[PDB]
Design a protein around this ligand. Structure first.
Ligand SMILES: O=C(CCCN1CCC(O)(c2ccc(Cl)cc2)CC1)c1ccc(F)cc1
Ligand SMILES: O=C(CCCN1CCC(O)(c2ccc(Cl)cc2)CC1)c1ccc(F)cc1
Ligand SMILES: O=C(CCCN1CCC(O)(c2ccc(Cl)cc2)CC1)c1ccc(F)cc1
Ligand SMILES: O=C(CCCN1CCC(O)(c2ccc(Cl)cc2)CC1)c1ccc(F)cc1
Ligand SMILES: [Cl-]
Ligand SMILES: [Cl-]
Ligand SMILES: [Cl-]
Ligand SMILES: [Cl-]
Ligand SMILES: [Cl-]
Ligand SMILES: [Cl-]
Ligand SMILES: [Cl-]
Ligand SMILES: [Cl-]
Ligand code: NA
Ligand code: NA
Ligand code: NA
Ligand code: NA
Ligand code: NA
Ligand code: NA
Ligand code: NA
Ligand code: NA
Ligand code: NA
Ligand code: NA
Ligand code: NA
Ligand code: NA
Lengths: 391, 391, 391, 391
């Protein structure tokens, strides 16, 4: 077993491991598109010769609270051959990529987890929450207060690329969890909008000046419309799009993977009709440089100036001062007032998890309940954290 | 149709309407127990003579943020005969009970809703969130950080009444959503802990000095344990009880109806094992007296002093000043800065819903985004809102 | 194997065979009640000594077209021990009972069939059709034309026996398929109206001056109400009862076993909401005396006088003259114009099956298509055929 | 919103609305084939410019009782964009098409309804009944009386087009509900007989001189054969085809969408094996010209001459005389003896619904029960009403 950056010769072997590892494998053509996001030394392979392990990262741009955009290393295409389990190959590959990511000057790494029990030990914490809502649209009536009681157009996605790009670009800069979507990923998205023989049905779009929804009828449940993506920049756009989706009179049910603070339920006279059918971790974060990440994001202006000493387990100890919505984070050997593993800081960082909830599980440790309330308020996001697109 | 306080003669007719209206009807013996919580003029019937409509309220004590206990009118046993639908009987009965509740000096009314689309128009807003977690305990491993790596005892519920009463009494005074559980409801709870021929299996309890869990094996799914109630006063107690439940080696799955901030997921090495299988509105609140309710609860000390003008639709307009965790709420004819229906204030009141989320649905209306952030922070609860027991 | 009328000593052995043969066995107490309807020589047993075969008939009164009530032998409690299959015991028992029934002067025998492939060969034809309608009552709206836009009362069945008896007695005399329901069967019906530990839920009744509905919530599907029986003497009563059932706001679905001409679908703005979920043969008829049965019923006055020659396979050949809604049916050796097996005549007799449909299957054989149209019209019932109660 | 006849330029926009509206959308190539049945001014669009509403009719030939063929306007391709619900677009489009259909001289319009609650208010009544039978062929044995105890050939559909056309043409002229099937619809039918990658399996045909059956194995249930179409001109052909289908020894079940008077059950020794698994409205009729439609069909010769006065709600009042199987229908201001909405007359017109059943729902109103019996008999069809093909 040797750990190397792959040569062009290695990629057929990587596509074999990928096809055998990922049931949702996009195939070599699509994989080659995504490859354009992987920097020169962004990939590692293990050879036994045949490829028995692989991992890479892509150059991403992640929005964090305060509309701050961080360069982010997006881990992806991580696989160990079923022949080479329990030989420390994942640990070796993650250690090497983290070395390269830290040396390259990324303050943050991110991934989508295949299972929930794997990445905590490598310092990734779940930082966004996926929330599936299923609406029985047959009963759905809009509240008298709901905006916009036609601004929306039913269109072919492939004919309005420019408009979706412009709306998404405005959305991703305003929302924590937002990711820059490069041209190659717009190519890939509009390719999956087409009907496939034996596969997905045709996708349609609802287009508003300030929002869009991409949806298709389920392959097998012909009374279910699945919203693949809804991006709205204004409340008027969000409501108008949902009025149009609830107008899909041939459907019984509309489903969407959204975030816990989606206002959809409050648009209806019966909030219970917007049923939570599924909940899971979305984006995971590893804070690579604690002071860089903590100084870079904005904090709630509602909390008054405070100082503390934060220790990250094997991540350093810092004098952390938060005031006027900004943090200063400097080295100190003073006694820690707060201790947590690196994964816990990732979970706190976009505002998806409360310091108080993590403290109740003893993942976050302080003797000061006032400090806990101050951290909770400071790390909270004004704009609710959302998940952009899986990678 | 005449609307009257029922005589003793009316109660057999009320029990008939109840049996026909409520599939979960506890029966006349249990109903007579709960009746001891209904004050002298706490009930209305409609006669056509036979009972075709009924509604009552019980005298409750509800904990709100700041550990403040409010006298609360708990609406219950609300039914219209299937023969007398669409004749305004619900509206007539609710109007009369609200008159009596307001005149009696209750600042707040509360209920559990049979359907989500009914009580908004009578000024009730959903104020707590039920969250069902299902744990596949076969895979569950506790995190190295989790407390208490034996303080817990497996016991017969009927033999440790005193201990459950004492623990519950400590829990309900500390948690917003907490309700005083009178002696008659402890009688009823321990009666439902017994096995029934053709019905529920025997209930067992796990007892800690600072917490308890009541559970039973599902009637039909013999690999599922259903936790009917877990009350823990400390994090050590919460973790210790979950270590014991995960030790139910004959079960595949443990389910509990809990709240969105339950720390259980963070106790495990795989947070995904604590799956959200169901989410619904719990307790609904109608604010009867706006200034009394707003002055009575505690507010977050993290937000700096601020003043605004709040208008409740047909509920009055108030100068609202919040500072040092207290509110002053006085009559004013000054221009409104914030407007909302009465139901919306109920949804905000225990901290379960953010002002910002309601604003995004246009249920809450202001031109000031800074005011919105201040309301969000002020109305937030330090201790997460939980649901006590259904009534 | 000897075939005998049973002595009192035989009945414990008959109750053992019954319990082993009938999963719906009502038990010895209920069986003893129904026994009061079995005349002195109304039962046969086969002994091998232990009971290995049994069959009996009850004295019934059946309404046929023209509101004519026929003495009817109701076959029931027919069983062969699983140890004694394929030994001709059913054929021997049926032959003996038919001998006794014919000699006793019954013009007609009737039964409910355990399976569809058994009784045709003994001359029974299916004569009524069971039609299960399931209404999704959440969507159900009554048509502007529907009668009665409160005449109906929600009551305890056991408290209004007299009223149900009087309504049923009016219904059974007006409807072909109607059966006299003796006092012992009213005792049995009101006993099954009670909740059972581990069994059925409590039954309720909707009572109108000219109709009633008995219903209960399903044991396991708590959003389904099952109507066990709806008897309405007028269209106003039928509509009023359905308005009340659709008012069961806690239910998603109402199901009823009714007849193909139930007007319920036409009461709604969406006829499709009254979904046919199940269809089966109900009452089976064996015509014992062809001329007695054919002369006894009324015929459609719309068809002009006609004469034909009907041959029943091993049942005789008859000159059949139909006019002014009456038939004369006399012996003849003239050439047959119509031939059919005895079972086919049973299927025609209450108007549930058209001569033309049976002719298309070659169960009914004529060279005259005009004769076929005349038989179709003559045998049709003005009042649609319904099924009274299973026996 | 303007309502126009579409130009060629509009049809791409109509195909977009169609694809988004109809999950069973046949696609632009097939849609262009069906278009050949739409006359010059047979289509309307609503433009907001983009197509937000559409409706058309096709020139059909419908067989009614007495083997009379009526020119029929077949409404189809009716859609409102999900963006433009509740703006009266359906009402506007239906009003314009009905104007054009009436002015063009069509006595009748027809459609297949997407939902049951929509078309009643525009004067369409359900006029045929779809009845799905599922046969467990493993148990199926033919009755000793059943015809034809080999006349049938297993063939490739595409090789025997001429024979299917000739048989169908004989069937459609003899059966009420029969439609002329133009060459373009035979092209489309034989195209759907081919296997599709990820779609339907290959279709086979059973061919008799006087009947055919088209069938295929279900996509997912490989023990179910689905009969798409069985057309038999004689009882011998019907029985012979069913003997062949019951010979599909690799299948457990055969399903067919047929009519309520299908003789299949009576061909078997166990009639219960032909299970009704589904029942729904088929063809809907709007009578455009009451006297033209009522004079055009044949009536039962069994009923003696009678006269009445029929009022159709906003459809005129007529002296209706029926005798010798013919109707004369003339204007009158005499008192109405019978009143009904236009939709009700459509439901009566092919004989699928009895006047007596509609009267019991108060959709048909008379004080004369003798008149009701006479209408029932007169409007009855000698040959049972069937459904030809959906459009
Ligand atoms: O495979 C990937 C990225 C996963 C895409 N992708 C998987 C599932 C989806 C949904 C369904 C969304 C995102 C890749 C990355 C880099 C590379 F060089 C080659 C391939
Ligand atoms: O019926 C009630 C209260 C519902 C009890 N109860 C229903 C479901 C449960 C669970 C399952 C929990 C609470 C009542 C109230 C007042 C009165 F005077 C008579 C009866
Ligand atoms: O068992 C019977 C009659 C079946 C009752 N019964 C079965 C099912 C039911 C439903 C469910 C309705 C009717 C009998 C008859 C005569 C006798 F002497 C003893 C017993
Ligand atoms: O789309 C249609 C007619 C529906 C075909 N079609 C739908 C379902 C099927 C089955 C499955 C049978 C009939 C049309 C009509 C006119 C036009 F100009 C363009 C298209
Ligand atoms: Cl912020
Ligand atoms: Cl999201
Ligand atoms: Cl607080
Ligand atoms: Cl809770
Ligand atoms: Cl009659
Ligand atoms: Cl019936
Ligand atoms: Cl005819
Ligand atoms: Cl048909
Ligand atoms: Na923002
Ligand atoms: Na690409
Ligand atoms: Na993924
Ligand atoms: Na507290
Ligand atoms: Na009690
Ligand atoms: Na409840
Ligand atoms: Na009658
Ligand atoms: Na009895
Ligand atoms: Na039975
Ligand atoms: Na014909
Ligand atoms: Na074609
Ligand atoms: Na169709």
């Amino acid at each position: 077993v040797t750990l190397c950056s792959p040569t062009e010769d290695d990629w057929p072997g990587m596509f074999l491991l990928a096809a055998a590892s990922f049931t949702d494998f996009i195939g070599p053509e699509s994989a080659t598109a995504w490859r354009t996001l992987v920097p020169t030394d962004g990939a590692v392979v293990v050879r036994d010769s045949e490829v028995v392990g692989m991992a890479l990262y892509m150059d991403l741009r992640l929005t964090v609270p305060g509309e701050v955009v961080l360069p982010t290393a997006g881990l992806s295409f991580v696989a160990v051959a079923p022949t080479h389990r329990r030989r420390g190959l994942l640990r070796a590959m993650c250690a090497e990529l983290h070395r390269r990511i830290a040396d390259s000057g990324y303050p943050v790494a991110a991934l989508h987890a295949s299972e929930g029990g794997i990445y905590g030990r490598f310092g990734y914490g779940p930082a966004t929450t996926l929330h599936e809502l299923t609406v029985d649209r047959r009963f759905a009536r809009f509240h008298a207060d709901a905006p916009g009681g036609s601004s929306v157009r039913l269109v072919r996605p492939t004919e309005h690329r420019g408009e979706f790009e412009a709306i998404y670009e405005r959305w991703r800069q305003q929302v924590p969890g937002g990711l820059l979507r490069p041209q190659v990923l717009w190519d890939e998205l509009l390719a999956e909008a087409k009907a496939a023989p034996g596969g997905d049905r045709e996708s349609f779009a609802l287009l508003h000046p300030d929002g869009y929804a991409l949806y298709r009828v389920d392959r097998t449940d012909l009374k279910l419309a699945r919203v693949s993506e809804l991006r709205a920049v204004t409340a008027d756009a969000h409501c108008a799009l949902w009025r149009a989706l609830i107008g899909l009179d041939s459907m019984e049910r509309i489903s969407i993977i959204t975030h816990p603070q989606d206002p959809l339920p409050h648009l209806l006279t019966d909030t219970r009709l917007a049923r939570t059918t599924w909940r899971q971790d979305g984006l995971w974060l590893r804070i690579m440089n604690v002071p860089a990440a903590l100084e870079a994001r904005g904090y709630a202006h509602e909390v008054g100036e405070f100082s503390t000493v934060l220790e990250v387990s094997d991540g350093g100890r810092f004098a952390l001062k938060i005031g006027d919505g900004r943090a200063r984070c400097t080295p100190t050997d003073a006694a820690a007032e707060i201790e947590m593993d690196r994964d816990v800081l990732g979970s706190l960082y976009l505002g998806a998890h409360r310091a108080s909830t993590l403290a109740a599980a003893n993942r976050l440790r302080t003797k000061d309940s006032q400090l806990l309330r101050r951290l909770d308020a400071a790390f909270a996001s004004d704009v609710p954290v959302q998940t952009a697109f899986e990678f």
